[PDB]
Amino acid sequence: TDANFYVCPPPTGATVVQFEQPRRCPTRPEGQNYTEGIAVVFKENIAPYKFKATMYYKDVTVSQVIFEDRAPVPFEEVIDKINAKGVCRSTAKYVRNNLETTAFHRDDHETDMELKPANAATRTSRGWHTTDTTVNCIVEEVDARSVYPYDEFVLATGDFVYMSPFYGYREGSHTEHTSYAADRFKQVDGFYARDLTTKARATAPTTRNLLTTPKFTVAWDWVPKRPSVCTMTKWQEVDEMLRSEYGGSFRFSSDAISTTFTTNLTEYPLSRVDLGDCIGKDARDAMDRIFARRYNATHIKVGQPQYYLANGGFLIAYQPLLSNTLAELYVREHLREQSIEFARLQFTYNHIQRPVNDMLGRVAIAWCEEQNHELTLWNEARKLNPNAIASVTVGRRVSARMLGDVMAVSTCVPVAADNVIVQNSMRISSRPGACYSRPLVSFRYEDQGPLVEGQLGENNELRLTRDAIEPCTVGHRRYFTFGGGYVYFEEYAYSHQLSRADITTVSTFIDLNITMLEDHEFVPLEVYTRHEIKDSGLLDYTEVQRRNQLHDLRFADIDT
Amino acid sequence: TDANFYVCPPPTGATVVQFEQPRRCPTRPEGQNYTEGIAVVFKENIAPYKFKATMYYKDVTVSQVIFEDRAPVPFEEVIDKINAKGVCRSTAKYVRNNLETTAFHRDDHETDMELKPANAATRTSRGWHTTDTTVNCIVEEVDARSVYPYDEFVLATGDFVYMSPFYGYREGSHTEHTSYAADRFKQVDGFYARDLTTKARATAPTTRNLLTTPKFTVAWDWVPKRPSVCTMTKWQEVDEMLRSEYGGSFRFSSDAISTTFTTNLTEYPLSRVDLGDCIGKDARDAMDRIFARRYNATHIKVGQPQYYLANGGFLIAYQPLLSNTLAELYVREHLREQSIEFARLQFTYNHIQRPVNDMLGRVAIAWCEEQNHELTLWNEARKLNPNAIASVTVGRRVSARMLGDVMAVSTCVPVAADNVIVQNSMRISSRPGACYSRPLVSFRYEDQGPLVEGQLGENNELRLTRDAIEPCTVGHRRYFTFGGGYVYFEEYAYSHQLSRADITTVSTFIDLNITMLEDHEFVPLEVYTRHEIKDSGLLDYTEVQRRNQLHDLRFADIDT
Amino acid sequence: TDANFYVCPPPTGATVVQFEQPRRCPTRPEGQNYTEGIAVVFKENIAPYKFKATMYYKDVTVSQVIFEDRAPVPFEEVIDKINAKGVCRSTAKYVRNNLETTAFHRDDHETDMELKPANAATRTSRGWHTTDTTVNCIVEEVDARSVYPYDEFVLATGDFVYMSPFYGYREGSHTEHTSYAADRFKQVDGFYARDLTTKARATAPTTRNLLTTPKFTVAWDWVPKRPSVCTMTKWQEVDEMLRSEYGGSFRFSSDAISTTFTTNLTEYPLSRVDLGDCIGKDARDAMDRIFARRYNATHIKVGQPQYYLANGGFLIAYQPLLSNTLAELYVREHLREQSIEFARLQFTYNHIQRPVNDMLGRVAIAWCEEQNHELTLWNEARKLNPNAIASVTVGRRVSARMLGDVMAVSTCVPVAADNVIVQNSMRISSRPGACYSRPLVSFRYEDQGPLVEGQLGENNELRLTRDAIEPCTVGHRRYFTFGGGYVYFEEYAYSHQLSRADITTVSTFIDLNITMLEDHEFVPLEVYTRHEIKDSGLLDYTEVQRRNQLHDLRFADIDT
Ligand SMILES: *[C@@H]1O[C@H](CO)[C@@H](O[C@@H]2O[C@H](CO)[C@@H](O[C@@H]3O[C@H](CO)[C@@H](O)[C@H](O)[C@@H]3O)[C@H](O)[C@H]2NC(C)=O)[C@H](O)[C@H]1NC(C)=O
């Protein structure tokens, strides 16, 4: 059996994800009123609303040998030519020198041209384009996403739209906010959509909205109004959380959070809002689940739960707990003063609270110390190879690229191994002494689909563009992941495909039973005569850090 | 005292070692019939057979100012000239334009030439070479390795040999398979070997085999037949393993394995083969050892052990166990129905099995989550610096290079610190403003041995070739590991050698007691006038990621 | 709220810090006489003595279009012109061709020139310089540090000084050692210092020392003699340490140390020195603190503490302990022979000591195995980004650079976010198609202070020099850390500043609730016509490892 491949596309920044940074742990435990317990953090309900928003634009170019730009298609053309006729107007209007200018298709006259589907055959959208002055009409049914405010939504392209998806005049929808002018937006009642490939017309009426941006036009199905939802939502059911009071503000820490929260020491009156039932039941049910898992036989509940707001918009519901052994000290001191009511009794005995404040302090410091050890290492790994870190962070293969100091994310298309073919000879004849460093592959997004060219990337990753090249040396021996097994390549030529069991595997951290032997460097004689380069595998950190050094000397010689 | 140095050679791919990749953990525990226990995984006995196979070949070159290649030496020359005379024939035959062609030694006539030992003085072999058209006869007693099938063996060079080492006609050895023609192989009965350095002849008869490959000739001692061995062997004595039944197949997971196994839910009848005693006793003894270590006072054995096959060829022997506290629930329910026979009683009570299925599920998910955290980080570290990861993975200093998506391995030669000398002036006078970035060293593989030139690498690593150079700046201050201590170098000049105790050490993860002060940049005045570059130490990830950016701009200027 | 920025300067090597390297763990536990306990390691008291040592030097340069060098200012000039007049002599003496040579200021005659403060406005010192042949007199009140020997001290610049700070003839100070000649050093009794900015003279007498080095002159306040101190000091209060006897030497290992110690098996007679009380009380108090924390209810003290010396100069105080359950076996065997005196009774029963020797062996091996896992990873992270590792290792933001195989350290200046301004347009008009890859910033070291130019670095780091540039592409979208939040930049133009809560955060290790969608690559049409480059974010390890490959091919074409 072979695993499914993945063709990760470059993210455009539609989804942005910052990654936690190391905090500042206390060198010595100085907190007060330490106490353990079960906590359930909640993240603000962003209310992600998704809809396939269709984008329309015209690309104008000149074959003179200039001044190419993207202009938006008008509303009448979309509803008359593209919609009622499935064609795009050959002529287009673009701004130049602060004056409207007209363009044509290959220096021709106005003629109806149909919209053909995209050749990429990707799942993003059909991406209808007419041509694979020179005007080109392109239509794409890309995806879009909105947030809880609903005043602005972002398209798959990443360009923020300053118009609410529910804006319109058909009904009393979100007509309270709009950045673009009235003429820049138009709503059609009783509109009918259709597929440009079949042109079978919509089965039922579907009102369509239209917005003309400075660079493109967008349209989508106009829904009257999405119903309300909880304003608060669960984020993580922490198994154990320690509360620390210091500087007039609590300090919450946990092992499976890697982030510390700060409150105002006052319980937030969650009951003042009607959402208390939606979150109260959800939060209360979580306490019993975690408490009944392992704390029912070793801890006692300290009063009722408590809710506190945290910096950044996080809502935390706490449930203080104390070990059974610690209860013996509290009850013993309680009986002394009298000569089980743990509520309002915690922190009463300073001497009993003195050791626990220090004992739990090391635990909090230990978690902070180890958490920073992983955070400082995880961040570097993300920068080194965000794709690998992205996949292990979202439970599935996902693309990602570093947009400076913020992480980007985009979905990867899975394709079965039966729809991919690897080129036998990876060597390229267009340039001797230089060829692709990885095997070339051909594949189809689906069974019987069109064939496309590409390159095989690391970890069964497929790259649309073939650019991984290097100065191909002699005596090259390498292996590349291909489905459930590897593919053996020697001297830049397909030798044979070997399964996963044909290569020794060091699963455990330490494995001294390897049958390794003393290797003898069999340097080919051609390198000693033709003064060429010999294979060295992928560059080591010291090697890559050394290869650039040689380059630095090359520019000095050229400059001198 | 000083530690021993290491001169790691570049691996040729003789030994290949894939490294585990992150698995896919379940977001929620959906397994059924959870149970802990002691497990002992077994790896298929590869039966590594090693033998010093002698390689013979002739390198032909032309001094015209072409068409150089490696040809194999015939059998008569090896047994008559090299063996019975310790010399190599000056003339050689090589193929050119699909026609046999003859060559000579420095445009001379046929003359007997002796074989002199190699100047490298490495432990791989003597590597006898005659010369340090132009033909050159070279003989090397390199090492070789075979696998359980024994039909094909691999030499230290890495070139696979499609001839079984036991092939021959002297006796009923492995004569059932052979890829090369009969004329390409020859066996000599009662053959006598000898050392080309002493030429004292073998002490006893030693039948020698001979194979002529398209690029070289190989010979080795012909052993009649290695005796049989166990077909199964131990790989790891897991302290704790959790079995999970899901989708009609078990799922084995452990903390010290980092890999999940899949079975068919049926116990493999290991007793059907005679090897059951060899593995049964070995496996049974391991259960008592681990059980008697920590599980004898907190767990009870659930029936007899069970053996199951796993994907990839791994054999796993399980021993289900249950905590003593959990036994109280089973016995309590057992007595209820009656109104210690844990065997065939597990999973009978669904309500009792409901919480354990979820409790143990988090443990399995926790191990999978943390295992992926290390796997995704370990893989990047291996790619960054495979030498460091290779040494910590095989318990000893070992070389390694990335052969694409598979790890290579080769042995490193240890040399005492008393046989190495460091050059005082690392600066090179052949080119101003550019010199070696690391100190140069001279050493001998053994006491009183020949002296060779080399460069000092990271972590007491010795490199045969001196290539680590960079644009030597001004005001350079650096330290390099040298034996048990460091060597101080300032302005590219040996200052003095300081022990390990002369430099502050931050052993603990966090150390705030450092006596660090505010450093003042003492930029030399020469840089402000001679517009040269100033020292900056080894490049940071952002610096190296920034240095290439400057290079990218340099090519644009050159191209423009 | 916004966090404080940090401008880390390049360390000059004044403080050097080696970092622990992976040890060699035993494949199988072979130690003898295993035992747990509380340990407190001690590091030799280095006795760091700090003093603001003022450096004086004259920079001579020639405007011919040579032979520029740094010379030391004489003693009379410092005490007469700089001290009694706050000016520097225009003329200076420098060596050339082994002959004294005179220089002038801009080819002028001798004239008094005052010393103006530095324009950097750094906390290192005022750095008075006269000019912002051509001679320039510069005075800097840099910091200095000394070690326990006190014979040599190091300045902030990093140049070691071979003269004791207490050297002199005014009293019986450290006059027993001096490397420089008598004429090279001079001490002034009853000297008076002053501030060159105010010139208000010292309030009280302050004897000043003066030393003339081959490249500069240094002066500082001469203290008679620092009082004595403890010769030993605490380093870490280990919670648990395991002692292993093997090869006639003990082997100490702990989880929070990551380093193994070796002794001579004999208790060091600490009582022979008067420091036993200073360290005995300090060490004894630590045992009770750790013992009373968690070992008072589960372990029993085995005799009195024991002190042993360790390789490298570390003093370790041990306190053997044994679990309560293990005591039942010792007392049981003790009563058998008789037919609580644990002291001198440990290791008496070989059979009872056989399992513990193996059980504790795995713990020691487990710690060594996991410790090497972090050490081998921590070292690579330090090399990758020493600044991040430096900050998390010293509890505060600190600079660091790799000086070969030794880590450098220097303090970073914190500045409030209210004293920094970010440039709106990061693009540079001096060169199209190439600009700064990070936003440019302007700031002042303090409120109302002078404004300086700089660049914004990663993790709120400020760089004095603006050099982070790259071939600016089209359709660039990136985020940069700015105070408590991020700054959004699109197409190399300041768009707006968004808080930390405006970007999704993946705090937990695995977060599958992201609202990620399928991104559609919106490639600008200008790239398809103007054949320019498209944005790709920060380079991935495979990308950077691939970018250099393209460069390698560029030099081949140029060379060919
Ligand atoms: C802890 O309590 C303090 C004090 O109440 C909280 O700060 C306060 O936050 C409120 C909003 O929650 C601020 O009110 C608003 O402030 C500005 C004008 O100052 C404006 O947006 C509105 O007109 C309104 O008045 C209030 O100013 C602010 N007070 C102070 C002194 O900063 C704080 O947020 C609480 N912390 C947590 C974690 O809940």
Ligand SMILES: *[C@@H]1O[C@H](CO)[C@@H](O[C@@H]2O[C@H](CO)[C@@H](O[C@@H]3O[C@H](CO)[C@@H](O)[C@H](O)[C@@H]3O)[C@H](O)[C@H]2NC(C)=O)[C@H](O)[C@H]1NC(C)=O
């Ligand atoms: C779990 O059980 C299944 C079903 O028995 C195993 O798959 C079976 O594996 C056997 C060999 O072990 C296959 O037999 C051979 O298959 C091909 C022809 O199909 C050929 O090599 C031989 O002539 C022989 O018949 C059998 O086809 C295959 N069955 C299926 C349905 O795939 C499977 O390996 C077991 N898994 C484990 C982990 O033990």
Ligand SMILES: *[C@@H]1O[C@H](CO)[C@@H](O[C@@H]2O[C@H](CO)[C@@H](O[C@@H]3O[C@H](CO)[C@@H](O)[C@H](O)[C@@H]3O)[C@H](O)[C@H]2NC(C)=O)[C@H](O)[C@H]1NC(C)=O
């Ligand atoms: C364990 O014990 C051995 C043996 O006593 C220690 O080695 C010895 O260390 C002393 C100094 O502590 C050495 O004495 C000095 O040696 C040289 C001349 O050899 C010179 O500096 C002085 O004149 C003085 O004699 C002694 O030679 C040395 N002995 C041996 C055999 O090496 C060792 O240091 C102890 N280990 C620990 C960890 O305490």
Ligand SMILES: *[C@@H]1O[C@H](CO)[C@@H](O[C@@H]2O[C@H](CO)[C@@H](O)[C@H](O)[C@H]2NC(C)=O)[C@H](O)[C@H]1NC(C)=O
């Ligand atoms: C720890 O908790 C105790 C118990 O609530 C706090 O002690 C009370 O503090 C309030 C003022 O905050 C006083 O009016 C009460 O008399 C105190 N005692 C009791 C029994 O309530 C204590 O202040 C808390 N610690 C800190 C640092 O605030």
Ligand SMILES: *[C@@H]1O[C@H](CO)[C@@H](O[C@@H]2O[C@H](CO)[C@@H](O)[C@H](O)[C@H]2NC(C)=O)[C@H](O)[C@H]1NC(C)=O
């Ligand atoms: C978990 O184990 C139990 C006990 O073996 C399984 O329950 C039996 O299932 C078989 C069929 O596989 C039935 O014939 C038996 O009657 C069941 N009960 C007993 C007491 O044997 C159960 O199927 C297992 N779980 C899964 C998911 O297969």
Ligand SMILES: *[C@@H]1O[C@H](CO)[C@@H](O[C@@H]2O[C@H](CO)[C@@H](O)[C@H](O)[C@H]2NC(C)=O)[C@H](O)[C@H]1NC(C)=O
């Ligand atoms: C482990 O400790 C025991 C107890 O001290 C050592 O046994 C003693 O060894 C000395 C010599 O070193 C003998 O004179 C004693 O007779 C032994 N027994 C006792 C009760 O003291 C033992 O040698 C230690 N292990 C090792 C490897 O040295």
Ligand SMILES: *[C@@H]1O[C@H](CO)[C@@H](O)[C@H](O)[C@H]1NC(C)=O
């Ligand atoms: C908690 O433990 C008590 C005491 O054994 C038991 O009666 C109760 O049912 C347990 N609760 C849960 C939810 O398991």
Ligand SMILES: *[C@@H]1O[C@H](CO)[C@@H](O)[C@H](O)[C@H]1NC(C)=O
């Ligand atoms: C191979 O494994 C066995 C146990 O199966 C072990 O005893 C032996 O030492 C290992 N071989 C090497 C070379 O370490």
Ligand SMILES: *[C@@H]1O[C@H](CO)[C@@H](O)[C@H](O)[C@H]1NC(C)=O
């Ligand atoms: C296991 O524990 C029992 C009960 O204490 C004891 O009798 C037995 O000897 C132990 N077995 C081993 C192998 O330690």
Ligand SMILES: *[C@@H]1O[C@H](CO)[C@@H](O)[C@H](O)[C@H]1NC(C)=O
């Ligand atoms: C140095 O260590 C001591 C304990 O030995 C500690 O109290 C002190 O704070 C440390 N110094 C600094 C500057 O942190």
Ligand SMILES: *[C@@H]1O[C@H](CO)[C@@H](O)[C@H](O)[C@H]1NC(C)=O
């Ligand atoms: C240690 O435990 C004993 C027994 O409970 C107790 O009497 C003693 O006070 C404890 N000592 C400390 C320092 O906590």
Ligand SMILES: *[C@@H]1O[C@H](CO)[C@@H](O)[C@H](O)[C@H]1NC(C)=O
């Ligand atoms: C989002 O979180 C909820 C729990 O709050 C979980 O049930 C759901 O599966 C998550 N969504 C996805 C797409 O995984």
